[PDB]
Short mmCIF file of C-alpha atoms (C1' of nucleotides) in Angstrom, two decimals:
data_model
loop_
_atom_site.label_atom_id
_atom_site.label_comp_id
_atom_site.label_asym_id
_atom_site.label_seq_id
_atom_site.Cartn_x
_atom_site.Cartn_y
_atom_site.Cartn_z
CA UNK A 5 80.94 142.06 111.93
CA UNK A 6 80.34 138.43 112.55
CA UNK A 7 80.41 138.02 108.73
CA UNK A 8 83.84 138.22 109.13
CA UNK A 9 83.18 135.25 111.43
CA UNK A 10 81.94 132.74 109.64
CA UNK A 11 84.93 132.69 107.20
CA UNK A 12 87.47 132.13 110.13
CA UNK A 13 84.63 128.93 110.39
CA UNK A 14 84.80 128.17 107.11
CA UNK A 15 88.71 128.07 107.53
CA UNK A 16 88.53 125.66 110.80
CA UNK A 17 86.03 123.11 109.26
CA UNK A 18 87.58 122.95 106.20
CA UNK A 19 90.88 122.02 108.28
CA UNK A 20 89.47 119.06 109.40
CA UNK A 21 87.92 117.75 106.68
CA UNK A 22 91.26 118.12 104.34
CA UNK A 23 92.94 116.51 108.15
CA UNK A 24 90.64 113.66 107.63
CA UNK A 25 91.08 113.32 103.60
CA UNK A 26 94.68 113.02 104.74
CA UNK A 27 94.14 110.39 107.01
CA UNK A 28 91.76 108.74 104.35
CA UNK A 29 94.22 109.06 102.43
CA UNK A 30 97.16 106.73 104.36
CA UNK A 31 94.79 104.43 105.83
CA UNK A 32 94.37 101.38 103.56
CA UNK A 33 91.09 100.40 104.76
CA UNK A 34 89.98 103.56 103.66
CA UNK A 35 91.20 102.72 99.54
CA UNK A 36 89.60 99.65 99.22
CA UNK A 37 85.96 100.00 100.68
CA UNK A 38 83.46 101.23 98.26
CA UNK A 39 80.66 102.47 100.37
CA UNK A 40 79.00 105.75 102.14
CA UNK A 41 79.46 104.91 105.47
CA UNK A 42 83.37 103.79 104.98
CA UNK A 43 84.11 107.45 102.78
CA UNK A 44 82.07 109.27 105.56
CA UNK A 45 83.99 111.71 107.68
CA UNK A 46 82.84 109.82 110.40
CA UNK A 47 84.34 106.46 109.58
CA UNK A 48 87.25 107.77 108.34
CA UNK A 49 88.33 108.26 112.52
CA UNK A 50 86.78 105.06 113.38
CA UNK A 51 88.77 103.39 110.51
CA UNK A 52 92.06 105.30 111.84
CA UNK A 53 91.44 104.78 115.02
CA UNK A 54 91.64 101.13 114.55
CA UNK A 55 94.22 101.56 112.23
CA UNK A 56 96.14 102.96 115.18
CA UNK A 57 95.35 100.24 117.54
CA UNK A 58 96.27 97.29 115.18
CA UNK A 59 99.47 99.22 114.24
CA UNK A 60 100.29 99.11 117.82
CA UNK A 61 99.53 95.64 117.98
CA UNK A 62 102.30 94.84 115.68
CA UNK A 63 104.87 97.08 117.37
CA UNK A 64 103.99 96.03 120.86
CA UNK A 65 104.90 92.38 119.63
CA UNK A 66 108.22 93.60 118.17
CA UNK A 67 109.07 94.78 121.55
CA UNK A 68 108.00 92.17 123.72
CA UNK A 69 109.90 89.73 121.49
CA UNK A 70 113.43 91.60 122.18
CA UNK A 71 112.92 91.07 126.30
CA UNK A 72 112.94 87.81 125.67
CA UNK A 73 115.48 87.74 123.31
CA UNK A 74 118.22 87.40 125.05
CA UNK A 75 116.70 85.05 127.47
CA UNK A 76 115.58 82.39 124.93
CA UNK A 77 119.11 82.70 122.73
CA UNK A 78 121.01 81.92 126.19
CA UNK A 79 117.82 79.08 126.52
CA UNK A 80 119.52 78.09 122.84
CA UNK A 81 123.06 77.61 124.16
CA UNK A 82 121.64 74.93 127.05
CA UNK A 83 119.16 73.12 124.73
CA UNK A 84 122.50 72.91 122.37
CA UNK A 85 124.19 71.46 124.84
CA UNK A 86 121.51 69.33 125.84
CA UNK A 87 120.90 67.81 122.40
CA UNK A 88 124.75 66.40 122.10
CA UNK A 89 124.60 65.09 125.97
CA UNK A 90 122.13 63.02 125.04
CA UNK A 91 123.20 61.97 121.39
CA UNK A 92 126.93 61.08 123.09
CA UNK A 93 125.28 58.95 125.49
CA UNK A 94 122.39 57.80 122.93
CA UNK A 95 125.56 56.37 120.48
CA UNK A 96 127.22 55.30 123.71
CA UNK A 97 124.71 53.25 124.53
CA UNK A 98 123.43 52.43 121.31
CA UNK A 99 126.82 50.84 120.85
CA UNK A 100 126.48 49.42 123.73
CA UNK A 101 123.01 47.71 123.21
CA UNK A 102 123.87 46.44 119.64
CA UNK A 103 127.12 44.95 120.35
CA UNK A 104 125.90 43.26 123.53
CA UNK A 105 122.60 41.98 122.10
CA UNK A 106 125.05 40.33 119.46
CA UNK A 107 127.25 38.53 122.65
CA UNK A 108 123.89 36.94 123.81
CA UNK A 109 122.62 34.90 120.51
CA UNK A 110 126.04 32.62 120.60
CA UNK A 111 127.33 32.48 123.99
CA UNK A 112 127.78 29.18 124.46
CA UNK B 20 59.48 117.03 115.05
CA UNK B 21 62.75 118.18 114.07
CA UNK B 22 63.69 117.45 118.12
CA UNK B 23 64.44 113.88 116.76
CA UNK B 24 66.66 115.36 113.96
CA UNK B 25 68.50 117.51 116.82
CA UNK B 26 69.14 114.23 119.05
CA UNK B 27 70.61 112.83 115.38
CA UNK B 28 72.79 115.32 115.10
CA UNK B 29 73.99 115.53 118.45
CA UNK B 30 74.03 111.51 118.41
CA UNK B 31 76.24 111.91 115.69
CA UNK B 32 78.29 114.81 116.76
CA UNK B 33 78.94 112.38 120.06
CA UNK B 34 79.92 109.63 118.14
CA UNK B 35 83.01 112.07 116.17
CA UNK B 36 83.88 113.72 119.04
CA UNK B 37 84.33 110.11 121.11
CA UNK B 38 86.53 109.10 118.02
CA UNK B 39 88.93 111.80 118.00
CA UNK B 40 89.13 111.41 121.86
CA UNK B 41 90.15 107.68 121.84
CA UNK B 42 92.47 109.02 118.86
CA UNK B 43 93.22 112.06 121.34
CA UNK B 44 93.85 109.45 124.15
CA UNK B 45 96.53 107.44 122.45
CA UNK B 46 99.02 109.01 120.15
CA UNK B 47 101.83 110.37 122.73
CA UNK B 48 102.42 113.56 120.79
CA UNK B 49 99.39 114.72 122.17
CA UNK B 50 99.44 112.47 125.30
CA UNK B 51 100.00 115.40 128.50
CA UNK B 52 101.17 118.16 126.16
CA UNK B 53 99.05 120.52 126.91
CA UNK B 54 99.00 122.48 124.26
CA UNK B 55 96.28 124.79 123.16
CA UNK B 56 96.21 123.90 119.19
CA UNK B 57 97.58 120.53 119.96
CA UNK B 58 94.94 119.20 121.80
CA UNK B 59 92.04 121.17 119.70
CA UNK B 60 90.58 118.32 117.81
CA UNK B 61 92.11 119.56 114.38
CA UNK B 62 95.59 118.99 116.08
CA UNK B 63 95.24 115.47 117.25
CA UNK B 64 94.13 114.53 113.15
CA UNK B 65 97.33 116.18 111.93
CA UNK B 66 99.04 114.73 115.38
CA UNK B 67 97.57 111.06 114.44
CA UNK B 68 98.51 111.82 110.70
CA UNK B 69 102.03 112.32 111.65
CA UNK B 70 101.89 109.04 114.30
CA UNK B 71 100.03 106.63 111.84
CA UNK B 72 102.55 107.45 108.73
CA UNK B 73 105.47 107.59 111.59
CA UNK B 74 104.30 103.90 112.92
CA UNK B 75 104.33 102.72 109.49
CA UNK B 76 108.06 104.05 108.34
CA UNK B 77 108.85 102.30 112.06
CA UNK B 78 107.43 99.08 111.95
CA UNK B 79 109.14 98.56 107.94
CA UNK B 80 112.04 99.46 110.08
CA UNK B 81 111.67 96.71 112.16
CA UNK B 82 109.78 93.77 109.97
CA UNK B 83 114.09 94.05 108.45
CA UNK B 84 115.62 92.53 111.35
CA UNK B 85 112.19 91.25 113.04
CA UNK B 86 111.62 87.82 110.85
CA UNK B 87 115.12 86.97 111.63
CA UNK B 88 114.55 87.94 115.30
CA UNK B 89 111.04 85.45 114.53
CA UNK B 90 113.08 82.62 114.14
CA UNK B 91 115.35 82.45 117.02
CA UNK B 92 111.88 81.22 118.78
CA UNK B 93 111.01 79.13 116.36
CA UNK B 94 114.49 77.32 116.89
CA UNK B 95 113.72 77.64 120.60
CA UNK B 96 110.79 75.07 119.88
CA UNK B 97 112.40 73.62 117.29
CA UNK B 98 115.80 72.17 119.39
CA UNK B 99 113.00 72.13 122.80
CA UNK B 100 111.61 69.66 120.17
CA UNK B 101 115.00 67.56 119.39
CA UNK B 102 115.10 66.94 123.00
CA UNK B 103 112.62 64.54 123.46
CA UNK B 104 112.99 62.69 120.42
CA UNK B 105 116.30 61.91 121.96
CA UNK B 106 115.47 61.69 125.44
CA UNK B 107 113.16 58.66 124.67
CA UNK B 108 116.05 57.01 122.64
CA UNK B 109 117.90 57.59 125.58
CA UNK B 110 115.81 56.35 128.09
CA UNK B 111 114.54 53.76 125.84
CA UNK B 112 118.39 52.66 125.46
CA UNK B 113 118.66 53.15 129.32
CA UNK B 114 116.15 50.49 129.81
CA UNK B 115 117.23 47.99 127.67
CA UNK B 116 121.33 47.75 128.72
CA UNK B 117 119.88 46.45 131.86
CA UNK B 118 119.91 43.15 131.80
CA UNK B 119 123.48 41.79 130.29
CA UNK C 30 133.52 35.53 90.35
CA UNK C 31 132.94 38.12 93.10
CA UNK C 32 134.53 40.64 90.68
CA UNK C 33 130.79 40.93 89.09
CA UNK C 34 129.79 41.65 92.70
CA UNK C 35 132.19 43.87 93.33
CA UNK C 36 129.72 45.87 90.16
CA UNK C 37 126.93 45.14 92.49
CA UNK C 38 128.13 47.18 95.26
CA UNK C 39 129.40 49.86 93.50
CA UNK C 40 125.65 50.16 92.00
CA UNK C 41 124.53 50.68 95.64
CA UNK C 42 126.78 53.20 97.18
CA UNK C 43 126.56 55.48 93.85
CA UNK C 44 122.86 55.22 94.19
CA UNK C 45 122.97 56.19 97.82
CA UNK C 46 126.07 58.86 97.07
CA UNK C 47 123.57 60.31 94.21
CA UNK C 48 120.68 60.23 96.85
CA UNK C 49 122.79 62.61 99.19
CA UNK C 50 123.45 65.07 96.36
CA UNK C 51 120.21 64.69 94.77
CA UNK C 52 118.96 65.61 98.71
CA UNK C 53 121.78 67.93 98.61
CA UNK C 54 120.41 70.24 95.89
CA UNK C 55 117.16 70.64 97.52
CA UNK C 56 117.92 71.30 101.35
CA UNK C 57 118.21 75.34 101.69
CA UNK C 58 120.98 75.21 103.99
CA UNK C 59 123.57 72.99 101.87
CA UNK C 60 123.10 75.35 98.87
CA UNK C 61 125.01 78.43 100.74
CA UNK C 62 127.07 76.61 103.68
CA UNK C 63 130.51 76.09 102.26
CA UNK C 64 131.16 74.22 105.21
CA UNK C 65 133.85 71.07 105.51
CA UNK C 66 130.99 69.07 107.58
CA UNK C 67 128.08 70.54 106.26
CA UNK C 68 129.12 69.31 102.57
CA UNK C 69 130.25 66.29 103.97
CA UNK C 70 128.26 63.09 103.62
CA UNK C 71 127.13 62.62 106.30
CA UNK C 72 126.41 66.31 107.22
CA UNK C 73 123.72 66.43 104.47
CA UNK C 74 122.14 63.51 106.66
CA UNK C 75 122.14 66.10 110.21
CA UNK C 76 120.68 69.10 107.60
CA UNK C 77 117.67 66.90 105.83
CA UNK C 78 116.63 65.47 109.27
CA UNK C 79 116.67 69.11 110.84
CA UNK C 80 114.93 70.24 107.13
CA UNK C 81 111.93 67.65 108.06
CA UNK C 82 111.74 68.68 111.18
CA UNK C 83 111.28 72.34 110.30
CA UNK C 84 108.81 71.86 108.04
CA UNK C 85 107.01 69.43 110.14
CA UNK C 86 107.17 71.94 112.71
CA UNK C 87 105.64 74.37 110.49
CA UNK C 88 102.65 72.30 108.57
CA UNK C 89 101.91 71.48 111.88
CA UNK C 90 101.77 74.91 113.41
CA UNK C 91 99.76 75.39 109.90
CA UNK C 92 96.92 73.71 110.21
CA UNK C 93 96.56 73.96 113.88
CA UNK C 94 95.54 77.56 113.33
CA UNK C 95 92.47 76.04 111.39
CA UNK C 96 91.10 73.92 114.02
CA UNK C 97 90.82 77.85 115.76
CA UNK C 98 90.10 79.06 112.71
CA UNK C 99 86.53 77.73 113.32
CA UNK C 100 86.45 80.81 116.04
CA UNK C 101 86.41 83.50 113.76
CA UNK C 102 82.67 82.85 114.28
CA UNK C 103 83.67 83.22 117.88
CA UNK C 104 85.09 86.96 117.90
CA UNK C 105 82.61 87.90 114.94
CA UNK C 106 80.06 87.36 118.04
CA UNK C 107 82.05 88.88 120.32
CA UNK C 108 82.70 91.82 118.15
CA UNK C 109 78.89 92.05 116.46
CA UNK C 110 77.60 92.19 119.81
CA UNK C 111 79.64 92.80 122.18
CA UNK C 112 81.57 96.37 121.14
CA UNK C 113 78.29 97.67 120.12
CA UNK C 114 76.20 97.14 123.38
CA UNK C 115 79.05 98.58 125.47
CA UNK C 116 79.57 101.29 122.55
CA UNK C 117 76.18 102.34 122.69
CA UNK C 118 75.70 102.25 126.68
CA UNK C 119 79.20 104.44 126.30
CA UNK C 120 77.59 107.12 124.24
CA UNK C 121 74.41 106.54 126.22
CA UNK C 122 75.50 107.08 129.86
CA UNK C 123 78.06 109.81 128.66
CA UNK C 124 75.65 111.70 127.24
CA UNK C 125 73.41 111.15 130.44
CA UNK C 126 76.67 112.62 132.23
CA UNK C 127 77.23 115.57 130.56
CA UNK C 128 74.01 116.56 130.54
CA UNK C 129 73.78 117.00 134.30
CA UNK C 130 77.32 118.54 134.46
CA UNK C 131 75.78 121.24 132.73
CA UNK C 132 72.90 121.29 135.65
CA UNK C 133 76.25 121.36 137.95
CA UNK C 134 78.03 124.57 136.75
CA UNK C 135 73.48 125.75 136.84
CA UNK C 136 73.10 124.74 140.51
CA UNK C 137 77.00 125.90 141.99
CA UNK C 138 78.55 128.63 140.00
CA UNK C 139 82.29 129.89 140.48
CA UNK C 140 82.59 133.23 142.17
CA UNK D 7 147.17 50.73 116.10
CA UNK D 8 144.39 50.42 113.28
CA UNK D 9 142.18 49.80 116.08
CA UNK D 10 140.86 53.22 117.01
CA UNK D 11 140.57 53.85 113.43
CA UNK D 12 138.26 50.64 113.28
CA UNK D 13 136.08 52.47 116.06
CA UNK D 14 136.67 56.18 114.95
CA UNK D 15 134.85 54.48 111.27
CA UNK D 16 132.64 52.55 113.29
CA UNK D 17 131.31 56.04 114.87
CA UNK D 18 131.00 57.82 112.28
CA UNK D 19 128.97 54.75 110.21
CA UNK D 20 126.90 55.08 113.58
CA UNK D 21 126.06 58.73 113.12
CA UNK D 22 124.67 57.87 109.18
CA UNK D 23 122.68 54.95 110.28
CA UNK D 24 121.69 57.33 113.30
CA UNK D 25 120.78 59.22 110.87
CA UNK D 26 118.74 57.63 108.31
CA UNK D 27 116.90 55.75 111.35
CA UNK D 28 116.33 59.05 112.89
CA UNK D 29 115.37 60.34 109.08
CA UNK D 30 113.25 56.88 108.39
CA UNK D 31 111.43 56.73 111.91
CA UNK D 32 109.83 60.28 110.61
CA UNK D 33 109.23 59.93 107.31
CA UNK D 34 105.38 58.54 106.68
CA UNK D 35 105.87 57.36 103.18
CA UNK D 36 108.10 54.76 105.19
CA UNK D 37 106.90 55.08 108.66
CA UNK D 38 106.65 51.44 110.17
CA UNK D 39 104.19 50.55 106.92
CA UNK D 40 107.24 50.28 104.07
CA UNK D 41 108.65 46.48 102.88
CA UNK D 42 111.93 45.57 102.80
CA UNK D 43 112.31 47.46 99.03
CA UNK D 44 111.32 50.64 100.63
CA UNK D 45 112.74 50.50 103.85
CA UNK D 46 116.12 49.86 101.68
CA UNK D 47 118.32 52.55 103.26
CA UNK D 48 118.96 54.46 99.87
CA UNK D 49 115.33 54.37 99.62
CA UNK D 50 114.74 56.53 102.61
CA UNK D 51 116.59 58.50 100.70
CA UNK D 52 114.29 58.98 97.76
CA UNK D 53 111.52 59.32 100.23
CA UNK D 54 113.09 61.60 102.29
CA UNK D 55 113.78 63.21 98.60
CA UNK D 56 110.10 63.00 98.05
CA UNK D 57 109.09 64.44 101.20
CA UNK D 58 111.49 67.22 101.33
CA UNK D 59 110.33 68.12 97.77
CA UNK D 60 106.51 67.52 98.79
CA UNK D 61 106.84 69.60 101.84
CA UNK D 62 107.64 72.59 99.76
CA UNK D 63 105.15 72.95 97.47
CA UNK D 64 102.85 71.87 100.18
CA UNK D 65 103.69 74.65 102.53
CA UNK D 66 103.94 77.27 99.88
CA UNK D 67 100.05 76.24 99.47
CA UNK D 68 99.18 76.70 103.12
CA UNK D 69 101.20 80.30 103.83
CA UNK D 70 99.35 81.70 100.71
CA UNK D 71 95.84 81.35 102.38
CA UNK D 72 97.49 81.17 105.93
CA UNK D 73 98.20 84.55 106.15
CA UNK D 74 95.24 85.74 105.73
CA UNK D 75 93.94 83.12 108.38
CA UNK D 76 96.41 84.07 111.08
CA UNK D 77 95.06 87.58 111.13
CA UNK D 78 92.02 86.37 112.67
CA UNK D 79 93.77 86.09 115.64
CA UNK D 80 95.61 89.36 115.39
CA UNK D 81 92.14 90.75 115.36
CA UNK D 82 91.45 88.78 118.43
CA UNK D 83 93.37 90.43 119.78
CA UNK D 84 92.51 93.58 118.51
CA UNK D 85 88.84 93.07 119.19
CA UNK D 86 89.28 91.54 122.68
CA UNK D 87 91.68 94.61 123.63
CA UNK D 88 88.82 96.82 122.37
CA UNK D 89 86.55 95.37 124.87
CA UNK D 90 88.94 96.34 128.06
CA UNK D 91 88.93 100.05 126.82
CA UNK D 92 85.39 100.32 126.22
CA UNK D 93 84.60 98.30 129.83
CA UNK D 94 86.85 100.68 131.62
CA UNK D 95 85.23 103.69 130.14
CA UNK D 96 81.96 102.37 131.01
CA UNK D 97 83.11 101.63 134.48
CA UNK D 98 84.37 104.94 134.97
CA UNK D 99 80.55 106.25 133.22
CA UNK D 100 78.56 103.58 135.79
CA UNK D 101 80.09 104.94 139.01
CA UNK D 102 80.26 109.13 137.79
CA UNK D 103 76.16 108.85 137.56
CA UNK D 104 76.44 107.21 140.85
CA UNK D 105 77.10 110.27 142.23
CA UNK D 106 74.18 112.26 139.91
CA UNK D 107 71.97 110.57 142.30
CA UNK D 108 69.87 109.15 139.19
CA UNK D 109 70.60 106.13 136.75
CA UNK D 110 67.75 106.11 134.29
"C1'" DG E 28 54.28 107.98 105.16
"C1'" DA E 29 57.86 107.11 109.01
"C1'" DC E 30 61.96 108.31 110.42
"C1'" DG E 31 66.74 108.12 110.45
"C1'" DG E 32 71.79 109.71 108.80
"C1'" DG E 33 75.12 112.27 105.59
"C1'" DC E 34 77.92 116.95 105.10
"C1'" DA E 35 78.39 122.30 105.23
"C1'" DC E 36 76.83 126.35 107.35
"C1'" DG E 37 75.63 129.51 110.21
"C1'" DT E 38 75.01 131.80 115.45
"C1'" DG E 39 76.56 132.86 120.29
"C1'" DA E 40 79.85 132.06 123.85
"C1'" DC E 41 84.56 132.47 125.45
"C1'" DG E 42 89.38 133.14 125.74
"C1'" DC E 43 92.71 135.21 123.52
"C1'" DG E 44 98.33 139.06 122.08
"C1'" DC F 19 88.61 145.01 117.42
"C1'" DG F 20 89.38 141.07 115.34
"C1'" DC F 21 90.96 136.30 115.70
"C1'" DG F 22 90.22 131.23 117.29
"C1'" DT F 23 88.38 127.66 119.97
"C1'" DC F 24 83.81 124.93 120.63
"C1'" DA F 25 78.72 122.64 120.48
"C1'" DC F 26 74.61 123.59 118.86
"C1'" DG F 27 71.31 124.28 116.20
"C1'" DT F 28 69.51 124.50 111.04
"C1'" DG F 29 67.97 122.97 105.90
"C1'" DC F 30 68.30 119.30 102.19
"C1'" DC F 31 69.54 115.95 99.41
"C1'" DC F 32 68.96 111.44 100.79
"C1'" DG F 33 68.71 107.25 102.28
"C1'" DT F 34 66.16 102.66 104.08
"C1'" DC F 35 61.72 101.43 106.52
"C1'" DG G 12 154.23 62.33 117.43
"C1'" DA G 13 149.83 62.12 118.45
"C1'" DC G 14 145.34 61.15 117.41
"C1'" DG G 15 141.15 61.83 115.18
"C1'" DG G 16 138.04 62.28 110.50
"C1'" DG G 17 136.83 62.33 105.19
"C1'" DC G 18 135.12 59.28 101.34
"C1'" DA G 19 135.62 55.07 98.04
"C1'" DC G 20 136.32 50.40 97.90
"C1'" DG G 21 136.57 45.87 98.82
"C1'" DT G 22 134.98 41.44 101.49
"C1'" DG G 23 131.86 37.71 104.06
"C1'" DA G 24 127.30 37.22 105.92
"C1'" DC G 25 122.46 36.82 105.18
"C1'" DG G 26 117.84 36.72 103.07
"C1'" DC G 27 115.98 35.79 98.69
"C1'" DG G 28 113.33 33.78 94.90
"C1'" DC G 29 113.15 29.89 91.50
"C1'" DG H 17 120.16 25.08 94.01
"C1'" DC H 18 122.95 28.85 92.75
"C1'" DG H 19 122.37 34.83 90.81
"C1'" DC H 20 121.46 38.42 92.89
"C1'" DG H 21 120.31 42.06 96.69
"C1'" DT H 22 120.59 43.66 101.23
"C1'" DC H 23 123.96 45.34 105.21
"C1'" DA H 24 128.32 46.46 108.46
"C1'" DC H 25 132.74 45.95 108.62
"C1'" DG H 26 137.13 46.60 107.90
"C1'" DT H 27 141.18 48.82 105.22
"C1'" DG H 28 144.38 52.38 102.60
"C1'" DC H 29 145.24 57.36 101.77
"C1'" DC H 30 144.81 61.71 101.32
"C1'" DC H 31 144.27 64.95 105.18
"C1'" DG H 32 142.89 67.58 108.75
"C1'" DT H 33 144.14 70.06 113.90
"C1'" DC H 34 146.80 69.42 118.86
#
DNA sequence: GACGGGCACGTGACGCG
DNA sequence: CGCGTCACGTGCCCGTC
DNA sequence: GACGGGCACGTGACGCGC
DNA sequence: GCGCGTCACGTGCCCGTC
């Protein structure tokens, strides 16, 4: 009657636990810490659920880094141009300071 | 007692269920499906299972062209950086022409 | 006369020639840019000072994640204490909610 | 006729010297502190040589215990992220037992 | 003695072609 | 009539206190 | 024809120590 | 009381693109 109940149980529990064995399984955390509370079912979700969140965190900076993408590679043409703007005029007048400074010693 | 073993239990059935639910709360597989085995709590492990091992085949994916998509930034500092060093030759040269 | 001068000289510039290609062999960027500027001279010159400044630009990003580095002590505190008290007050007052939304369905019922 | 020649050398013998001041005026090893031996122009060069070469080895040292230093952060991030989840959920739990007319 | 906390197992309840 | 959700109890083999 | 630009090579000038 | 050793400057020439 219900007999035949707890076997559909045993079924459903055993589920999860080979659902969390998986996730142990794929989770590095999970492969490398030696203890009773880390091989627990119980930290096994906590361990995932970080895993989760900090996997995330690296995706949600590859994303954010592509908005500005195309802002700070058109920022890299104008601090390109910037850079030879100021070496023309840097030589220019560098030239012009150290052949000047030179027509000042012997005037006369 | 065994009333304090019951409130361990319970503690610690509280503590599972509220980690499957911030797992439950996340992953958008199971975000507003509404599905009757997917959002049973032995869904959302085989629903994180496929999002964790899916995030990690993505984000290899990425890390290919990411560290060359690093450095454009790092340039951005970099040549931000050139500036200066010639802008004070510059306006150390522009302050010395002055008086000839 | 000067022609033993003349061996002077020629001392010099092969010793600074030899200290381009001797810089040459070692900056990244010369060793795969078949470029007419980049292998000339003075484009090895424009590539070493950009080198340097790279790798200033990078020691010195380095090591100015270790003056922070001291505040790993800082989120250790804000994670030893901090995730637990609200953690615990979480599975505290939600367990003080859902044990009088059981007293909810007791008081109103749904017919 | 020669003459722009005699300027189009004298520009480009600017650039190098340019160069090797903007290379010497960085380099420590002879950073306002070398002699005249040192701040010899194909000495720079042997600096810069040195420094370049230095530079390497150095920063390979750093990025082998650096990465595992910058994570820190990352879990800064992580663990100050944490802390807006768990606040908002125990916002939303302060205010629902608000309205059970009983705190504790 | 004091309790905790681990994992597996039963039940009743409830919603189901 | 069996499925299948689920939380809730329950020993027990065991920890650390 | 027009200019630029590459690199090697030769000089006077200058600072030097002996 | 001159051997070196700095350095920039010119110059051919072997050669690019406009």
């Amino acid at each position: 009657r219900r007999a035949q109940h707890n076997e559909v149980e045993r079924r459903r529990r055993d589920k999860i636990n080979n659902w969390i064995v998986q996730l142990s399984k794929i989770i590095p955390d999970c492969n490398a810490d030696n203890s009773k509370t880390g091989a627990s079912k119980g930290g096994i979700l906590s361990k995932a659920c970080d895993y989760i969140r900090e996997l995330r965190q690296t995706n949600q900076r590859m994303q954010e880094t592509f908005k500005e993408a195309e802002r700070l590679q058109m920022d890299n043409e104008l601090l390109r141009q910037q850079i030879e703007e100021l070496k023309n005029e840097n030589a220019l007048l560098r030239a012009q300071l150290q052949q000047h400074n030179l027509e000042m010693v012997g005037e006369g």
